[PDB]
Symmetry: C5
Subunit: 125 residues, 5 copies
């Protein structure tokens, strides 16, 4: 069992990925929770949004219906906050490190080797 | 420790992925929120949908039961909006950049290299 | 800024992935919404499921408790429908196109080149 | 337009992926649903868990507060069930197939090719 | 049918990934549940947070509104626990195994081979 989980993990391109979804989900969850506790309430004190129209579904009930705009705006703001947080926390550093050329990846090293291979092959002739 | 987390992050084919799931979930969520606040209500002012039949679960309760179509239809519209949104915002540009050729990738460059190698090895004959 | 987001996207193996999660989550959501509105109610008019046993948690409350089977079954049905939908819509077409041989890919072209190289190298020797 | 969606789909390394997320979310949801309907109720009849302490938030309300264990354990059990399910349904078969050598992959065929090349390049010397 | 799903599965880069999303979502779900059951309550007996301001939406209702801070801190702590959990359970072992090199992967063997090839091509000169 320790062998199946561990042998699958050496195999575990899956491990790199599982972690990625783990962080990705954990983090999106954090930004939206901040938005709900801090932002949505702010949107709400004001709320001259949520308009409406009469709603007596002759199939379900009968009383009144609304169009909540504050929620949409609350969500839009949440979205922007995510883009700023990700781009700023993540993007400035990863893009800066790839430009200064200090980050890595399997495809890139293969390329260097393939390239070196090309050069030597060229030298033989 | 700072070493383990950072070393794992340059490693972060995972980083590319985590970000991808982060945006994918964040965005799908934004579209569904719009569908729910703006669209579901419009579907609802009408609502000649939600039909039903008697429901007295001789196992749970006893009172009445409903089949909501407005929700099914509201959900479907949400989906189309996502398909159009992803395809139009994401698809027209990425597919157009690949056809014109501007977007890049590790596999493609390896190909270029392998190809040149093939051409050279052929030249040696 | 427009340059940074766009340059990271050209970079975006991530874009391929983010899009994938977006569609995958959006679609699963659609299937379950159909199951809940059309199917669960049907399970429920019948609902001779949800059994139970007394439940007075001497730690939290005291009143009664139930085992909802209708939900378990509704979910299962939801699942089978997903399997029929993905396999029938996605699988019949991708397995049939790979069998007839018409789907291109970076890994496959590389193999072709690697193979040509092997053959040529064998010719020199 | 039909050309853009279809050309992106032949392209769909993404399709492979979307299907993966689609299936992954669908299945996990199925297990947790079984956990909730079947398992949680059982945890709950017993429930000598959920302990507590008075809770009158002088900032929000005022009355009493609880620490639920049955849920923590219910989730824990849900989790073990997922691991056994994924590992047993998924892991025994893919690890056995990779070991017996039947599940193929572009990366692996390339390896064989690279390996063969190494061997040949070596015979020349 | 058994052939199409199975043929698609050997094909299944998708299988590696789907399993990855399954484990990532399942695990994040577990961390947050622990936080909610064990942690949020602890945060709450205390709760001198959830501040507020009057809230009578001249568009929706009219009565009062709150900015729940406890939830924000509760979510943050949840996040740390995930970071600690993934890195400590996942990171120490994978980072250590790669350093000891005990861990294997198709990309890495490709590199070794590319290197040897580079080295041999270099010897011919
Ligand atoms: Au009734
Ligand atoms: Au009872
Ligand atoms: Au109390």
């Amino acid at each position: 069992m320790l062998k199946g989980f561990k042998e699958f993990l050496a195999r575990g391109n899956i491990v790199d990925l599982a972690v990625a979804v783990v962080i990705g989900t954990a983090f999106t969850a954090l930004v939206t929770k901040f938005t709900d506790s801090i932002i949505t309430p702010l949107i709400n004190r004001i709320g001259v949004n949520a308009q409406s129209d009469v709603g007596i579904l002759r199939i379900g009930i009968g009383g009144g219906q609304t169009i909540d705009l504050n929620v949409l705006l609350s969500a839009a703001i949440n979205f922007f906050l995510i883009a700023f947080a990700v781009y700023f926390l993540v993007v400035l550093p990863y893009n800066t490190l790839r430009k200064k050329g200090e980050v890595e990846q399997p495809g890139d090293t293969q390329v260097v080797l393939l390239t070196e291979i090309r050069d030597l092959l060229a030298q033989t002739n």
